[PDB]
Amino acid sequence: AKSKNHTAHNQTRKAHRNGIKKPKTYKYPSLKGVDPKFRRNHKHALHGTAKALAAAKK
Amino acid sequence: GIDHTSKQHKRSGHRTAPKSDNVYLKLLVKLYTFLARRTDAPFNKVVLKALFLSKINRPPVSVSRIARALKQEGAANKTVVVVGTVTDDARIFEFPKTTVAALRFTAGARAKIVKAGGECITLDQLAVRAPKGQNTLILRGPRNSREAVRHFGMGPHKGKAPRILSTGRKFERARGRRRSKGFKV
Amino acid sequence: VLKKNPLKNKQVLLRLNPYAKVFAAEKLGSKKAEKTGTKPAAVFTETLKHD
Amino acid sequence: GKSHGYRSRTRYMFQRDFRKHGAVHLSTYLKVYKVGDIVDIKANGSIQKGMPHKFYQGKTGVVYNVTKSSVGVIINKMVGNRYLEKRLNLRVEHIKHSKCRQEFLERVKANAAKRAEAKAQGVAVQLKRQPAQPRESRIVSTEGNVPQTLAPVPYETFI
Amino acid sequence: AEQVAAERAARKAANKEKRAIILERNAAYQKEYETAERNIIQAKRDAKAAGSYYVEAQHKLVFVVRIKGINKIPPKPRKVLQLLRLTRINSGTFVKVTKATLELLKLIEPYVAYGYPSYSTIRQLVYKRGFGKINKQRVPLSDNAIIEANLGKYGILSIDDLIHEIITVGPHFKQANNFLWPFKLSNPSGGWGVPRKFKHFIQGGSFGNREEFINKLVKSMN
Amino acid sequence: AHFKEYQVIGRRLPTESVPEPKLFRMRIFASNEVIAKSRYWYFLQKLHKVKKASGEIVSINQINEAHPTKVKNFGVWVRYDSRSGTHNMYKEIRDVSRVAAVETLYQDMAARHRARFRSIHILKVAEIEKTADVKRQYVKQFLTKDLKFPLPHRVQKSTKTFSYKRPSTFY
RNA sequence: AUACUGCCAGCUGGGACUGAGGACUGCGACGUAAGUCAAGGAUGCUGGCAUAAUGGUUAUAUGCCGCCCGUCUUGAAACAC
RNA sequence: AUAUGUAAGAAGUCCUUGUUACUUAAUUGAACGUGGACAUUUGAAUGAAGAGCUUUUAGUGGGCCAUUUUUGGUAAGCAG
RNA sequence: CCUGAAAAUGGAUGGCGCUCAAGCGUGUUACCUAUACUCUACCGUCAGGGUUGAUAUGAUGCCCUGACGAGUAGGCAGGCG
């Protein structure tokens, strides 16, 4: 009793029912996967600039 | 006949005429449809929509959240509006003299507000005093802090609280959750 | 309640277009033109009849 | 059985080029990449480290990470009925800048210049681009250009 | 508080003033159409006299009618028809001709009959089957008031103003054409004139660019 | 349909490298103007390196028969495709206008070779007016001096189904 | 001149289907003007019957059409159950 | 050729750089920022019949046919 | 067009029949008719709206407007027993 092995028939229609809307983009994308040396310096520099901005407008 | 670009006979996707059979809630809804229709102020449209909401979409609002809202600069004398239940909070030791209009007040919340000196008001009295929602501040409780919502979107590498009854060692802390036993999620 | 179509119902026609009245009065549908007989070049007809 | 390896059916895709084999000239290493740059991906068959998968050959992405000899590229890969975020760690041999955005930056600079000139004078800048319009009326003469009559030719063997 | 006749008389006076503006605007539009037509004729005659050939300006506006039904349409032509708002058979739309528009029409040629409409057929289409889109609702024009209320921000204050913006493709052609609901036409009254429709107009069929014959087709269908 | 003859003059799109191209012309027998332009571009694509996108049409003018109520001999050189190959042929018609000569040529080729419109190129139509240049017998037959013939067996079409006398085919 | 084509907010007739709405309000036209109108949906005049006459139900006849349901199945009226 | 990635702006463009344990020979850069110049044309077309976002659950998981591309086979109302 | 051209019940351009066809090829019109298209009425569904009079009407009431309607497996809703 052989049967059908594979088909991509109807797959694109199924996808396009409620399908291929583009990815939702965000301001401030995630920093995951970034160089951790850069990430360390970014933590330190953001701390510093927050302190400076507080001093400027306390 | 027609190449339809959308689904036909599609409902609104939003509530109207709340599911509750509360006669007094229906009275409040009737009053605020009148207001939202004949006043052109966005506040009454918002309040009508919020009156339609279900219980889990009307999370309780603590008097601590009320105080944190009134701490906003220039918001000290605004009328706090909660479409839902205002609950007490014993993690705060002082409460200001605000006017809070809410659907329901717990005994503790009402007593705390009254002792602080402000007033607990129903939404119909709020409508009478501020028909256009003047000088008001709407507070909403935390919606995505339920226990049900922490199991939403569960899957590999999601970090979303498995649906479990007993918790502890030997209850899903094994193969598939640590590198010592096979893999990690 | 009921759509009355212009191009008939001269009432609806005039309601939509005040200029319909004077178009009809001055018969601008059948309007003559001034005659100035600019003569075409011989090469044009030569090319046209070129067998 | 069937074979679907990493470099499956890449026989011609990663072929170097005609008369462009051998070492890689140094401009590809002197080029610098910053986070947010748009880069086309075209794998170099000669360099086998940091090679993109054959899916990402000819795909354009955005830099999110710069390392010693590599960049991290964000790409939107179509999976099923949605787009997923993919982060490739590729080498600058396979990476190259994209001119698709650079044309747009040139246009935005020109738009700013025209905007400044408008704030000066008000001469109907018409910043917006437009598609090709239908051709306007023109007058073509026959002086020294009398039309040549053409007719279909008879059929002949030619063989 | 009485408001019996004073406000009514003021409204009547304002309406009379608006009718006056429409009257002079329509007279100017007629003068403009006539002058353009006579200048085209005179330019052709002058080029012929001078020994040249006067090339017509390529037509800036087309009318497209969907000729095929809504069954067995490939995805790309189907999407293009949906974008041109020809979602049903015999539905028509005005289209400003550019390169992008021309490629759109070329994609859906087997399913439409289009061509270069004339002032007469644009005026007849808007007068008889003119429906506007107001709050996503198809309401008959039937009044200069609704067109003024929905397009007076662009200066279009009457049905003949809208007609003029459609024919002499104006700066606000996109907005006027979008305000115009897709034209719901009947089958041609005398028939299609061909035994089979779904061949090109060149090959004895119906679909494709019947350049100026779209006027005859649409006037039969209207 | 009723064929009309058109002169169609078109050129290549003028370029700044060299403006005003050579401005070619053709005579095209077509049902209307759209088909006339289409056939012009067909034959120009066959002849020169041009297409509708790469060129433009500067003139279309339908041409009338000089004397559409006088009988002339028309030699028509055609080429056509059969089911096997391409053949050049030469026929001739007695007619009053070139348009009717071409229409009857199209009917003739359809009837005698099953050649449809698409597979026929009218190479040339030449109005020949002298005898001894008419080569076909089926034309020299009617150029006979003082020609007269009868129409035997006249069949008269009746409107009513039933007739009350036996018919006559006399003329 | 005629033909062919285009236009007319050109004119003049013969037919058919429909008459939804139910005080007014609106947009317009008419010597602008008191008022009238074909202008946000049929009124006016008249006749016969007032009863199985119309109509409903039912049985038949006639014209056209109509395979046996349920099921499993890619596919059932199936010589599948 | 047809299909295919990206871009066509306000989360944009340009400026003495404020922070840093990163980087630089180096207030060199890198990243993130304060502040500053820029709408009624905020930067092609067409459409948009609302956009986005969750939760939960049914049936299905034997398919078959047509045009075109195409494999095995002499071929098949064959198999893929 | 003819020869090439042979299969089993009697037999199928659908049939009768048709020969300057009612055949073949190609032009021109006229005409016929789908549950399609246009316009109208009515039903339902969806959507957008209007509406606080002390009055005799229960505001999921009274209204205006537009667009839609195929359906197995299946889901939900409003109802009948």
Curated annotation (Swiss-Prot), chain A:
<dbReference type="GO" id="GO:0022625">
    <property type="term" value="C:cytosolic large ribosomal subunit"/>
</dbReference>
<dbReference type="GO" id="GO:0005737">
    <property type="term" value="C:cytoplasm"/>
</dbReference>
<keyword id="KW-0832">Ubl conjugation</keyword>
<feature type="cross-link" description="Glycyl lysine isopeptide (Lys-Gly) (interchain with G-Cter in ubiquitin)">
    <location>
        <position position="51"/>
    </location>
</feature>
<comment type="similarity">
    <text>Belongs to the eukaryotic ribosomal protein eL29 family.</text>
</comment>
<dbReference type="GO" id="GO:0003735">
    <property type="term" value="F:structural constituent of ribosome"/>
</dbReference>
<dbReference type="GO" id="GO:0005829">
    <property type="term" value="C:cytosol"/>
</dbReference>
<dbReference type="GO" id="GO:0002181">
    <property type="term" value="P:cytoplasmic translation"/>
</dbReference>
<feature type="region of interest" description="Disordered">
    <location>
        <begin position="1"/>
        <end position="36"/>
    </location>
</feature>
<keyword id="KW-0687">Ribonucleoprotein</keyword>
<feature type="compositionally biased region" description="Basic residues">
    <location>
        <begin position="1"/>
        <end position="25"/>
    </location>
</feature>
<keyword id="KW-0689">Ribosomal protein</keyword>
From Swiss-Prot, chain B:
<comment type="similarity">
    <text>Belongs to the eukaryotic ribosomal protein eL18 family.</text>
</comment>
<protein>
    <recommendedName>
        <fullName>Large ribosomal subunit protein eL18A</fullName>
    </recommendedName>
</protein>
<keyword id="KW-1017">Isopeptide bond</keyword>
<dbReference type="InterPro" id="IPR021132">
    <property type="entry name" value="Ribosomal_eL18/eL18-A/B/_CS"/>
</dbReference>
<dbReference type="GO" id="GO:0003735">
    <property type="term" value="F:structural constituent of ribosome"/>
</dbReference>
<feature type="cross-link" description="Glycyl lysine isopeptide (Lys-Gly) (interchain with G-Cter in ubiquitin)">
    <location>
        <position position="115"/>
    </location>
</feature>
<dbReference type="InterPro" id="IPR036227">
    <property type="entry name" value="Ribosomal_uL15/eL18_sf"/>
</dbReference>
<keyword id="KW-0488">Methylation</keyword>
<keyword id="KW-0689">Ribosomal protein</keyword>
<keyword id="KW-0832">Ubl conjugation</keyword>
<dbReference type="InterPro" id="IPR000039">
    <property type="entry name" value="Ribosomal_eL18"/>
</dbReference>
<keyword id="KW-0687">Ribonucleoprotein</keyword>
Curated annotation (Swiss-Prot), chain C:
<comment type="function">
    <text>Component of the ribosome, a large ribonucleoprotein complex responsible for the synthesis of proteins in the cell. The small ribosomal subunit (SSU) binds messenger RNAs (mRNAs) and translates the encoded message by selecting cognate aminoacyl-transfer RNA (tRNA) molecules. The large subunit (LSU) contains the ribosomal catalytic site termed the peptidyl transferase center (PTC), which catalyzes the formation of peptide bonds, thereby polymerizing the amino acids delivered by tRNAs into a polypeptide chain.</text>
</comment>
<protein>
    <recommendedName>
        <fullName>Large ribosomal subunit protein uL4A</fullName>
    </recommendedName>
</protein>
<comment type="similarity">
    <text>Belongs to the universal ribosomal protein uL4 family.</text>
</comment>
<comment type="subunit">
    <text>Component of the large ribosomal subunit (LSU). Mature yeast ribosomes consist of a small (40S) and a large (60S) subunit. The 40S small subunit contains 1 molecule of ribosomal RNA (18S rRNA) and 33 different proteins (encoded by 57 genes). The large 60S subunit contains 3 rRNA molecules (25S, 5.8S and 5S rRNA) and 46 different proteins (encoded by 81 genes). uL4 is associated with the polypeptide exit tunnel. uL4 interacts with its chaperone ACL4 and the nuclear import receptor KAP104.</text>
</comment>
Swiss-Prot record, chain D:
<dbReference type="InterPro" id="IPR008991">
    <property type="entry name" value="Translation_prot_SH3-like_sf"/>
</dbReference>
<keyword id="KW-0687">Ribonucleoprotein</keyword>
<dbReference type="GO" id="GO:0005829">
    <property type="term" value="C:cytosol"/>
</dbReference>
<dbReference type="GO" id="GO:0022625">
    <property type="term" value="C:cytosolic large ribosomal subunit"/>
</dbReference>
<keyword id="KW-1017">Isopeptide bond</keyword>
<feature type="cross-link" description="Glycyl lysine isopeptide (Lys-Gly) (interchain with G-Cter in ubiquitin)">
    <location>
        <position position="31"/>
    </location>
</feature>
<dbReference type="GO" id="GO:0002181">
    <property type="term" value="P:cytoplasmic translation"/>
</dbReference>
<dbReference type="GO" id="GO:0003735">
    <property type="term" value="F:structural constituent of ribosome"/>
</dbReference>
<keyword id="KW-0832">Ubl conjugation</keyword>
<dbReference type="InterPro" id="IPR036948">
    <property type="entry name" value="Ribosomal_eL21_sf"/>
</dbReference>
<dbReference type="InterPro" id="IPR018259">
    <property type="entry name" value="Ribosomal_eL21_CS"/>
</dbReference>
<dbReference type="InterPro" id="IPR001147">
    <property type="entry name" value="Ribosomal_eL21"/>
</dbReference>
